[model samples]
Target: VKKLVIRVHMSDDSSKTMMVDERQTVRQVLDNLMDKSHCGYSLDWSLVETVSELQMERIFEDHENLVENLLNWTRDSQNKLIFMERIEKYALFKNPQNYLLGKKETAEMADRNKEVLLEECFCGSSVTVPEIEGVLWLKDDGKKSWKKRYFLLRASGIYYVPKGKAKVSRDLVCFLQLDHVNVYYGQDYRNKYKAPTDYCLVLKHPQIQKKSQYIKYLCCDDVRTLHQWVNGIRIAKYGKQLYMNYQEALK
Candidate 1:
């Protein structure tokens, strides 16, 4: 499965607007958003370029083609709670359990394979996932591990707590809007098999990374200025690596 992501500064707002699709380009993608916006927008693809290693007056020539070629749309319901996916008895390290919120003082990676929702904000608090709207499935900065750019949600909305007593149930659903969770990207905590350092936003598979098809929670790059300044991210050899899970696409 291929994925696409487009991130742009909101003309009216200060935050970035991220769009993820299975297949499409900026122009075609803007078409889908046409009906959902309060204002009108048109994509020019004139802003795509790799400026890090080149002069300012450059272009990828076919950047729009590269970006536009990887977008696809799928339907999903966001208002109500929905069953996303269930990892059967999943255990990442050695124990099987539910997802851990704020961890204990010193718990091992025992909850590595825990089951929990990834897109929702932390349970209970004024913050909501909609408020965050940041990039998802972010590749680890330098570690290759399991995690996708995630959108955090409150676990139990009604309750104000998410740790110890407030969790384990759906009342109030305590959780925060991390907006994205990358357990594999956690630098402070990593297991021995794949040391924290070993798993940078390491691509699960280099082939996908090399292809620039990461699921688009938000398209981000370090080119300070906006237009056409996408950075060229590099992944290891296609058949040389593997990772657990991270955002590939919304669906």
Candidate 2:
């Protein structure tokens, strides 16, 4: 069994070297780190992957094969693996009503339990995409130009209103399909794409080996909006599978 050595960063700027084999998943890696550091058991622990070049970051799902996923990174890539505690990593699963419904609806859901909510919304094999819609900056295809557009997230894909069109389903244009792309949080986009804000979101095909024109970049007004869009896209893409992944991680 071949061993792969990796450096896992902590929130406090410290890091640990971990030797992983092919069969170990992200969950196993987290458990190893927790044991090495003498950390108490907690479901909030997460493994984050940061790509410095793209200024992007994403948390690895607990069930994902760690070695297989790491192999996707290029040799010269400035990627870092971080072991940290992020309570929001599984927020969508723990608080489905909050993520999927409006304030009034969520308040109404307070009567029901989490398991019931999961069963009604996600465990039924079909997951509902949350209500994510707002004005966001979209990068131009040919130039380094960014334009503001009203975007709507749907189960099928993300739709945006054209410059002169009304925000109606008939006038909405499909921007990107959630089926084939992964969402990431972007940093320093102001220098990279002259984006309106540093809060940005990137969408790209998982198999894209390097920087290419096929990538989609979006700028949000703030951190909350960025998180909302990212989580919404994840729900749209993975649906029930994401919830199941979270459930398995709890064990």
Candidate 3:
């Protein structure tokens, strides 16, 4: 493959173009550039592509400002029996991993690999992420939030990554830049099961930083601890921060 040059925004309005080596995976470069750019997934909102909601909320709004709801799943008032249990049980097995089909009622997707992953947009069956990305978990001090700083992406349908298709980074190119990435297990609110997070925040970071400084934060001790930190950070950052006045655009 021929070397390609990409024009990228690395912090502020200044733009720079870097040559892409044929052997380099898009993830490798994007992950690197994101640091200089602060252009993590948390920044790629439809309206504003460079600011995290937590950032915006702090800059523009008073406390109690609401944000867009990413996971709106609901449940029952009781702790013993969940109202959504039926739906969860039914749709769950149909979950691509255990989906059953044919008269014998075998898991439909089980015939496939059990290595489930976030789906890409490629007409792929399970998870529907289009392009592969390294997620960056951005942390906010005042807002008390964590944004999954990641590369914006689409999904592929072919299921498995082809040879060198999902190129692996030579090193764990993403670490230590920030504090901790999104490392969660589950979630809840007011005694209701808020949602189950499979710990999906990816913080595009470097294994080592020019500066060794980072925020003091929680590393995943176990699934529960991680989830608690994640939910708390999210509430602080974006859970209630994406409420931009889109209708103003209509005005």
Candidate 4:
């Protein structure tokens, strides 16, 4: 596995095959792609990974080891790697308040500078996970039936209120841990999982290469709420590491 051959699909519907090595990082591969295309540089240009069976996707952070991540794929899996420009790849860094703050709060801080917002929200001694809560459809394990649940996002993890229960710290049941898990934007899950809507968020462990009952799925009421939950989970999970990643990418 010393020599790695990867086919990266371009945004223009074209593709290229590259001969890479295990030591290559995602940023290194992106730079090589940009160099070959002779295109103007933009930080938004990113590498994306799509899992067909799961109907989920995530952008590769610049500092991630490309081969290590790709190695998580199972044989015969229809996953793909693409080189493209995704503005949302760094959207949270650009507008921290928009994603972390409520609608009214975001509107109130619209005139504030981005750096100040970042410092206020994420630059403290420890990063803060915004308060994100909503009702979402949760798919029952080993069954196709989905039920409504009132969920809350906390710095420790996600918790849900049981039927006829109050939303208190002790009464909240642990849904999933934020650490060491990746949040993926679920695609076309309405048809796949009989979900109520297409606005779904998938939580999976990075080492989970294939579909399994362990994967957690939640369907949101709308796109904006989906983004809020996704970004909120990201802030909870990555915290300071996320800001560090963003700063490194700016170099």
Candidate 5:
């Protein structure tokens, strides 16, 4: 079979001529680049594209096969496929993992806990999968009240089926808003008059009202359960690359 020749322009301004089968997909070209580059690069948070003489850039999707769409659209001067990094993720992380938080001792435990979540927990795996059903203690925003609720995770959002109800749609709380969220052990003593329970997890969100930034806390039950929930929520918020969010926050 005849080969289609294309050039891959990399980060360092160096280029490589890639001889690929006409039937090869973008993934295949990436595979070729991986081999040619001796595994010096990866596709986790990166992109590939082709430029036309008209100065328009057409990015190649990871799953797309260049045999048809890209090849047909190519011009004489646009023989190159550009490989580049996504600025945010590149700035913060090299691979996918959540950023460790808490005090020194707490952060150490959290790090170990993350290893367990990534390696063992069922809900810690993929986002496409449905969530785990569990019970959590919910704190009312303004009323300063607490109640036990059955929570389910989906779409990287937290949904609770109201007591004695089949539906879980009072509100859709997206994890995307949790970009600046922080986790802590136990309840905030200043806000609440007393400690609610021994096994507790407190999730804090800092919101700006007028010119002041105040923190609101969400308290849940169980230390182990809290560990799972923290991992799950971070996973939900950041996908497999939680480190991306950390890097984003760093800047």
Candidate 6:
């Protein structure tokens, strides 16, 4: 039909007006701007409406045509479009292609990291994680002596190697089971090891298969490290359940 010109605003308060055929899609408009803008990062951008409130903002799909998206706009109600970087961390991690693709293809570089932080878990376990390590107090049993150990959290559970035995051998201390797990902060003096009372995370795991009620009075190095351990383990264990609840809340 007729040629229409639209303005795309940017986060930096700059705006660029581009003229396009009425039938052009968002992809076509973005593709058309490549040579003109000469920006390589344009591919990682998304289109959002400039509504008065944050809740009123809407993202236009890449396949949406200009006419279908802004057909009811008036001169007084002139709509605004902003091209900004997509909040894509969750999407990037969920996509396996991101793991297999080249580094330049990603807008964020942290997701492609595969460096092995430490080897703390066993080699025979079905689940494996790279570079997860921390320091914590370990108790053999509820009535046994407490020993401070360097712990590594993985999908299989929490593994540890003794103070001087690191890299030589690993012992699977506990497997995190969200089914009946309780995490909190506390001090237990019943054990032989009289460690400091401050900055500790107490994890209680109910034995399922052959074991009995297992209580771990683990203590982290600091408060932040304690939170990291609790959250990291919770995310690894209850990620799917939390995501489903998140979707339910969105609906």
Candidate 6 weakest ten by summed lDDT:
114-123
Question: Residues 107-214, candidate 5, lDDT per residue (tens digit)?
Answer: 223455554543442234454323545666665554546666666766446666656424355643342344555343443432442335544444434222111123
lDDT of 2 at 196: 90
Ranked by lDDT, the better of candidates 1 and 4 is: 4
Tens-digit lDDT track of model 1 for 193-218: 23323222221221122223332112
lDDT of each: 0.24, 0.79, 0.27, 0.81, 0.47, 0.50
TM-score-superior candidate, 5 or 6: 6
TM-scores for every candidate against the unseen true structure = 0.20, 0.86, 0.19, 0.89, 0.37, 0.38
Mark the 10 consecutive residues where model 2 has the least summed lDDT.
Answer: 102-111
Q: Which sections of candidate 1 miss by over 4 Å?
A: 41-50, 53-63, 66-251
Top candidate on lDDT is: 4
lDDT-best of 1 and 3: 3
From the highest lDDT down, the ranking of the candidates is 4, 2, 6, 5, 3, 1
Number of the predicted model whose TM-score against the real structure is largest: 4
Better of 1 and 5 by lDDT: 5
Q: Lowest summed-lDDT stretch of 10 residues in model 4?
A: 103-112
lDDT of 2 at 128: 55
Tens digits of per-residue lDDT, candidate 3, 83-131, equal 0101211132123232211112334454234323212211243323223
Residues 8-104 of candidate 6: C-alpha lDDT, one tens digit per residue: 8866889999887878876667666654666654445566654331112334445557665566444354446776655431232333233223222
